[PDB]
Write a protein that binds this ligand. Sequence first.
Ligand SMILES: *[C@@H]1O[C@H](CO[C@H]2O[C@@H](C)[C@@H](O)[C@@H](O)[C@@H]2O)[C@@H](O[C@@H]2O[C@H](CO)[C@@H](O)[C@H](O)[C@H]2NC(C)=O)[C@H](O)[C@H]1NC(C)=O
Ligand SMILES: *[C@@H]1O[C@H](CO)[C@@H](O[C@@H]2O[C@H](CO)[C@@H](O)[C@H](O)[C@H]2NC(C)=O)[C@H](O)[C@H]1NC(C)=O
Ligand SMILES: *[C@@H]1O[C@H](CO)[C@@H](O[C@@H]2O[C@H](CO)[C@@H](O)[C@H](O)[C@H]2NC(C)=O)[C@H](O)[C@H]1NC(C)=O
Ligand SMILES: *[C@@H]1O[C@H](CO)[C@@H](O[C@@H]2O[C@H](CO)[C@@H](O)[C@H](O)[C@H]2NC(C)=O)[C@H](O)[C@H]1NC(C)=O
Ligand SMILES: *[C@@H]1O[C@H](CO)[C@@H](O[C@@H]2O[C@H](CO)[C@@H](O)[C@H](O)[C@H]2NC(C)=O)[C@H](O)[C@H]1NC(C)=O
Ligand SMILES: *[C@@H]1O[C@H](CO[C@H]2O[C@@H](C)[C@@H](O)[C@@H](O)[C@@H]2O)[C@@H](O)[C@H](O)[C@H]1NC(C)=O
Ligand SMILES: *[C@@H]1O[C@H](CO)[C@@H](O)[C@H](O)[C@H]1NC(C)=O
Ligand SMILES: *[C@@H]1O[C@H](CO)[C@@H](O)[C@H](O)[C@H]1NC(C)=O
Ligand SMILES: *[C@@H]1O[C@H](CO)[C@@H](O)[C@H](O)[C@H]1NC(C)=O
Ligand SMILES: *[C@@H]1O[C@H](CO)[C@@H](O)[C@H](O)[C@H]1NC(C)=O
Ligand SMILES: *[C@@H]1O[C@H](CO)[C@@H](O)[C@H](O)[C@H]1NC(C)=O
Ligand SMILES: *[C@H]1O[C@H](CO)[C@@H](O)[C@H](O)[C@H]1NC(C)=O
Ligand SMILES: *[C@H]1O[C@H](CO)[C@@H](O)[C@H](O)[C@H]1NC(C)=O
Ligand SMILES: *[C@H]1O[C@H](CO)[C@@H](O)[C@H](O)[C@H]1NC(C)=O
Lengths: 728, 728
Amino acid sequence: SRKTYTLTDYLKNTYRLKLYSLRWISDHEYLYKQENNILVFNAEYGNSSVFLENSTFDEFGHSINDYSISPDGQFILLEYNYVKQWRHSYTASYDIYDLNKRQLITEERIPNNTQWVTWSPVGHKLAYVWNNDIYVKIEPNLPSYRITWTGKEDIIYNGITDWVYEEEVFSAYSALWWSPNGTFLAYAQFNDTEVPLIEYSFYSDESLQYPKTVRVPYPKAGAVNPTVKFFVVNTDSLSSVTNATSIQITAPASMLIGDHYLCDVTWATQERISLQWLRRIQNYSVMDICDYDESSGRWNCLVARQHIEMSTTGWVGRFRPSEPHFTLDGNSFYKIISNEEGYRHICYFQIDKKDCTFITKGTWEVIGIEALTSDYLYYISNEYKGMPGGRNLYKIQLSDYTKVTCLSCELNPERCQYYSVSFSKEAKYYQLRCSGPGLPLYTLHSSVNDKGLRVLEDNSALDKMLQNVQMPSKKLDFIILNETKFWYQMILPPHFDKSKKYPLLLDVYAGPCSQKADTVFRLNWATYLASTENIIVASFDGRGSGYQGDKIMHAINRRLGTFEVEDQIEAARQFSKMGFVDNKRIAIWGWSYGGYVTSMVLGSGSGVFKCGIAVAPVSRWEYYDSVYTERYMGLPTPEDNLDHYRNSTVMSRAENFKQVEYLLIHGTADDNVHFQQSAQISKALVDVGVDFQAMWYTDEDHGIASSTAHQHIYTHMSHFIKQCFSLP
Amino acid sequence: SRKTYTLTDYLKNTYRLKLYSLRWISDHEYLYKQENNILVFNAEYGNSSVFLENSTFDEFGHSINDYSISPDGQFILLEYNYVKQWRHSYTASYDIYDLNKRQLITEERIPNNTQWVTWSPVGHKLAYVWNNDIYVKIEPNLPSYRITWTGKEDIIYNGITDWVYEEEVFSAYSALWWSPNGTFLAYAQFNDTEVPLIEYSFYSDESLQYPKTVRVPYPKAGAVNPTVKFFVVNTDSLSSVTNATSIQITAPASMLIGDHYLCDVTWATQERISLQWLRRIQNYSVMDICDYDESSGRWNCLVARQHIEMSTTGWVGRFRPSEPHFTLDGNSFYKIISNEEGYRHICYFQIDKKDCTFITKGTWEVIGIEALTSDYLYYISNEYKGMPGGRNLYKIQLSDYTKVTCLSCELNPERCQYYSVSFSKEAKYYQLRCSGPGLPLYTLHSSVNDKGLRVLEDNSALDKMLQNVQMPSKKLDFIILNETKFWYQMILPPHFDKSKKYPLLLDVYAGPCSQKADTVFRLNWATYLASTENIIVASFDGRGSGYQGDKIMHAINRRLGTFEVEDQIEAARQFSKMGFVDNKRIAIWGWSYGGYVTSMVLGSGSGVFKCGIAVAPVSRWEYYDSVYTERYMGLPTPEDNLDHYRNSTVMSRAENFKQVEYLLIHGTADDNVHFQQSAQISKALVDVGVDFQAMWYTDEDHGIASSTAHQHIYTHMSHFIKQCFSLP
Ligand SMILES: *[C@@H]1O[C@H](CO[C@H]2O[C@@H](C)[C@@H](O)[C@@H](O)[C@@H]2O)[C@@H](O[C@@H]2O[C@H](CO)[C@@H](O)[C@H](O)[C@H]2NC(C)=O)[C@H](O)[C@H]1NC(C)=O
Ligand SMILES: *[C@@H]1O[C@H](CO)[C@@H](O[C@@H]2O[C@H](CO)[C@@H](O)[C@H](O)[C@H]2NC(C)=O)[C@H](O)[C@H]1NC(C)=O
Ligand SMILES: *[C@@H]1O[C@H](CO)[C@@H](O[C@@H]2O[C@H](CO)[C@@H](O)[C@H](O)[C@H]2NC(C)=O)[C@H](O)[C@H]1NC(C)=O
Ligand SMILES: *[C@@H]1O[C@H](CO)[C@@H](O[C@@H]2O[C@H](CO)[C@@H](O)[C@H](O)[C@H]2NC(C)=O)[C@H](O)[C@H]1NC(C)=O
Ligand SMILES: *[C@@H]1O[C@H](CO)[C@@H](O[C@@H]2O[C@H](CO)[C@@H](O)[C@H](O)[C@H]2NC(C)=O)[C@H](O)[C@H]1NC(C)=O
Ligand SMILES: *[C@@H]1O[C@H](CO[C@H]2O[C@@H](C)[C@@H](O)[C@@H](O)[C@@H]2O)[C@@H](O)[C@H](O)[C@H]1NC(C)=O
Ligand SMILES: *[C@@H]1O[C@H](CO)[C@@H](O)[C@H](O)[C@H]1NC(C)=O
Ligand SMILES: *[C@@H]1O[C@H](CO)[C@@H](O)[C@H](O)[C@H]1NC(C)=O
Ligand SMILES: *[C@@H]1O[C@H](CO)[C@@H](O)[C@H](O)[C@H]1NC(C)=O
Ligand SMILES: *[C@@H]1O[C@H](CO)[C@@H](O)[C@H](O)[C@H]1NC(C)=O
Ligand SMILES: *[C@@H]1O[C@H](CO)[C@@H](O)[C@H](O)[C@H]1NC(C)=O
Ligand SMILES: *[C@H]1O[C@H](CO)[C@@H](O)[C@H](O)[C@H]1NC(C)=O
Ligand SMILES: *[C@H]1O[C@H](CO)[C@@H](O)[C@H](O)[C@H]1NC(C)=O
Ligand SMILES: *[C@H]1O[C@H](CO)[C@@H](O)[C@H](O)[C@H]1NC(C)=O
């Protein structure tokens, strides 16, 4: 009976989680920002010298957005004038500071408006992208060599991804890859010549008299995609009297007979590079393994060494083919592939032998491979307790596959069931991040004996303040439909009394391979809704969700907008059954795919929901980008899946919105889910004569993430939900 | 105590006003459509033959949008495939039907996509515009002659106006003018080369995968305007072996020294044409009077016959310089100009004498000159009863200026105080349209003796149905501020009991020279609000309004967004004083300028209003079009009026919205008041953390006038108002 977690608490960020972001630099040391002084810590003993002080750049003259230290400690890269583009891309200006000579490098600098910069993985070589071309600097103070000359704004991209490659395939702006010791620089080249443009108004400061039209090469579903090429250049034989020789590695022939994507590049040795390609119909992929050829000076990709990967029940990978991890000599590698029972497990490959050996099996999936030593492989899985929403670090003995030790399950089972890990340069040490269900807990460990060295952060600061407030609780459980379990989670109000009728808000994402029912600790809008408004905020992972094998995941293949929406409605019904839910007060809300599902649900006239909110929803699949959409729906042609594209829009369900209160919200400068989508919904609802609520956000994009917009939307949503539930 | 006027009554249009739209064809006959048979009526005796039957075109094969009969009765022009553009512009396809030969003209037809068509004023010559060029047809079946070759989409306009000329100067798409007997075709040419474009998304049917970007030459305030040229061509000497000759008529030299507009063209004789020009700073204008010069084949405007008109207190004209009406010999003309007491009266000019003589004076304005015979001039004025919102037909004896007869005041003073008139080809007859405060009443009259011939329509059909419903009443009165009267109107609920506290909705337009307090009979949203919801819907004409002379009209010169908004707030206060108003329930709403004022008012934090709705508001003047904006504000430069442009935005008042409930509504395809404006408001409110309501209308323009959008918005607004007033 103290204060509750209020809307303002969330919005103003009064209760803050501490983190412990460290960047390893050797096998023995790491860096950490402390009161703006980057410090170097000794993994073993824990002592720390100051590496650089908040002082050093008092009079830089510019506000410093980020730093990045050369792998050999000698120089430090300074990032300023940060201007965001899409989710990962941005441009900045850069300056290099010599640490020996305590000075800034004044001549032959990095241009203003640089799109990407990266060090070589050892030493202090530099590669950067400027007006879509790649440049290399051997020494920070020396003149840079030009690698490509073809770069052209919104047409040719060298070393950086276009829109759809950034967002849907690499999850990165960067499209260049150094070889381990820095000899080679590989890069992708993207030709967007015939990719159609999305165009939308941007309004800017009210001083701007005419609105700007932003235009972006963006392939909607079934439209014309970019084409890609791959090159490797030798930075050691750069001339300054000759243009650099870039060596192309063509796609596999099987890929060349139609549209495809380059979807993974991973160096294997100093002279071996592995590449993964994927057909536009994303159920067939091929891996190439290429060796440097001394006498030719090109890259030989032995077809004997190819490895085909495909799926009959859906698409390849969770979102794309998994990345390989090679052994030091690079003759074999481990990779997560789905077994024949449909479960994602670690497989073991020989460069030239065509099959592989699973080194794990079970009714659970490997989340990712984390580290590879000479006789141990470390990975994260959801095996422990057989709960998919959990997350734990395991290690397996390379010389004996039965010897599997769980490195985190036992460490604190009550507080910690969701871990991630960050290893040191050779895995002498590792840092565990526990993120639920208790308050996050960062610790350090040495791999040699798996000894827990010390506690890095434990959020006891926050723990104090939090017993001062009536927090909500989280139940993670499952229900059974057709004797398979489907997990749900519920944020329950403080003093939850199971005999009363609570109003319930269904929190939905439901996208392919999504997981909204997990054991993470979160301070968010739902916390406020439970704590202050006594609303149960529930999420449910139905068909289509991940981490439970392909029978659940691929269940929506080619059939988006069906099973995942019906299972959501079902879950609602089940919650009524549970008894502590007010029947006549169930709501639903979600963002992106979440908004689509919300809308599809509200549109189905199942009468289960009183109302919902869709934020930046997809409304019909022909509008979303090709790489994502087609991965699940294939092509919107009559020979393929046009029928289901058309059978699955929100607008056809417009009529049924007559039975629900609806809130449509969408940022006008949304480059991802275009405003178009919401605009099509409103139109549909107007036409069939349905009242609803609406909200645009001028110049906000898909994040609606700008400070004041963020507060404004949640505020507007809160009022909506309260009035919908008749709370005061 | 029967049924009331409901929201559905308004939206579904259950109670319909009958009209009597007649198109005169001679001095003795007129046409009238009647369950789809155009009939010719005999003005004198009232009998009627059928002129053409709904039958004639049963199997035309196309749906017929409109007709237009050649002045000489021989042919009939048929308009189909109507596709709307802006307020007046559209394109259509056309067919000419021979009435003698009872046939359609099959060869040498009018192209699909014709932008404007018009007959010569006598005979059956044709002029049309296609891809921005002018063509003339001497006979309907003959090949057309090409007049201009320079026409170019969105750049060069021959014979039609660009955006801003259509909307703000000619109130017409058409920019060509026949001489009285059809000898000459005058036309304007518009060069939009450097006029910047407004661009906005259009979404179309949901089948359209990528949104279309509409782009339109549109000069915002202070931006680069179009330039204009004026030509006359002789249609009688057209060749078919020679490109046809267009004599240009340059603007006044005094105009060529800076930006200007052509703002009126009016033929005076068979060989005399009058032109009015206006400087971009719209307080100085010049009239040219041009004669055909047989000897040069050219047009001569003696500088000695020019007539300079200007204003020191504001701009010239109500919205532009008034049109001249010439005597038959074309040596003198009448024109409405403002006198030195500031009142708009009819002035009498001699082509070459530099002064003019007022033929009316008084504390009232002439609304317009209607007809001119050899010894009588007919006009509409707001003189009767000294009420500006009234409207009556007067006639003045040309031979004696003291002999002024009021032709309509007395006809039915109780039912009729707002008249318009339509004269026959020589003013032998005239049709009065009474439009308030009673139900509209159309009658016919002969001018010879001013005898009322018969009643054409009296809406008794509607009168019947209307006593079956509890209608509201309208009070028209004034209040006094600084011993001048300012008029208000109130739509009062049925059984209005002056001792109760009613909730009040302030209906605002407030634009320069506007009039929202008049005696017209209207069936609209306000009727519903009064009748069914017992809300007083009030309007108030404050400073800036028209028809009361320049001291009231010009009061907001260079100072938009001040006096007109403060007077609106004042009026609200006055209504509280009246005693029958609920203090804590005053609302305000308006559209366009009306939305601007509403917003400015809500933003002033006068605490008088609980809430308001802005539909397609102007938010800052730099966004609206040049011709309108500058007419009142001048140029947004530091040497001129930049300061007041900046001191008068809605967004700077954002903070004060914290004290009111707000609804922002705007059509996304608004080519007039661009969506941009509302987008800037929302952004401002978000940034300062103010909650509000919003609604966009996908693909609707400034009218929000499409059938389903129209119903949807008024519905959405109604809920808003009801909840704001706590009404069931
Ligand atoms: C952190 O301190 C260590 C030294 O402190 C530890 O030495 C161990 C041998 C052990 O006995 C332990 O109890 C003790 O606390 C620093 O190691 C140093 O490294 C460099 C040589 O490269 C030198 O500066 C020191 O001479 C050397 N110490 C020893 C005794 O070997 C280490 O530098 C420091 N780390 C930082 C950056 O804070
Ligand atoms: C990047 O842009 C900046 C800012 O526009 C440039 O800054 C100017 O640099 C020169 C130094 O000789 C001076 O003329 C000015 O004093 C600078 N302006 C400021 C505010 O510092 C800069 O030159 C550009 N840098 C690079 C790497 O080209
Ligand atoms: C980094 O790896 C590269 C690639 O193997 C090494 O470069 C080779 O060096 C040896 C000489 O010791 C030669 O056999 C090859 O000709 C080199 N490859 C070429 C042509 O690039 C290099 O030794 C490694 N280390 C460095 C130089 O940092
Ligand atoms: C319309 O008026 C025009 C001129 O106002 C008349 O034609 C001109 O005037 C006289 C009379 O025919 C001639 O001397 C000229 O040759 C004519 N000008 C030209 C070349 O067009 C014409 O008579 C009138 N037509 C009608 C319908 O009455
Ligand atoms: C049109 O209006 C302008 C602006 O109101 C008038 O010019 C102002 O008046 C006097 C005399 O020119 C000056 O002291 C001001 O500096 C003027 N202001 C500006 C910005 O022009 C002008 O008199 C009017 N008539 C015209 C076009 O001659
Ligand atoms: C209408 O009638 C005209 C006939 O003239 C006589 O009409 C009688 C009704 C009567 O009033 C007499 O005074 C008139 O002299 C005829 O000539 C017109 O052409 C007719 N018009 C039409 C369109 O039918
Ligand atoms: C390198 O390539 C560019 C473009 O092809 C060319 O203009 C430039 O001259 C070349 N430089 C040398 C050294 O040949
Ligand atoms: C990929 O999936 C599509 C759609 O079901 C189908 O046409 C094809 O058989 C699949 N191809 C392969 C190689 O699995
Ligand atoms: C054609 O007009 C006459 C009016 O007298 C009417 O009787 C007939 O039914 C009409 N048809 C239409 C379409 O109104
Ligand atoms: C105009 O359009 C229709 C449809 O394309 C065509 O059949 C017709 O003949 C066209 N001709 C004209 C009127 O120029
Ligand atoms: C008339 O004008 C146009 C454009 O200047 C020219 O191309 C055409 O050849 C001319 N022809 C005639 C018919 O005189
Ligand atoms: C950053 O500067 C100093 C340098 O050592 C650091 O100790 C301190 O905590 C920070 N300075 C302050 C007091 O803000
Ligand atoms: C069993 O599967 C789902 C849940 O997985 C269930 O709701 C459905 O009714 C059954 N089968 C189907 C989808 O035909
Ligand atoms: C009279 O005009 C307005 C009308 O309310 C008022 O604001 C003003 O104070 C009065 N007088 C003067 C001197 O402006």
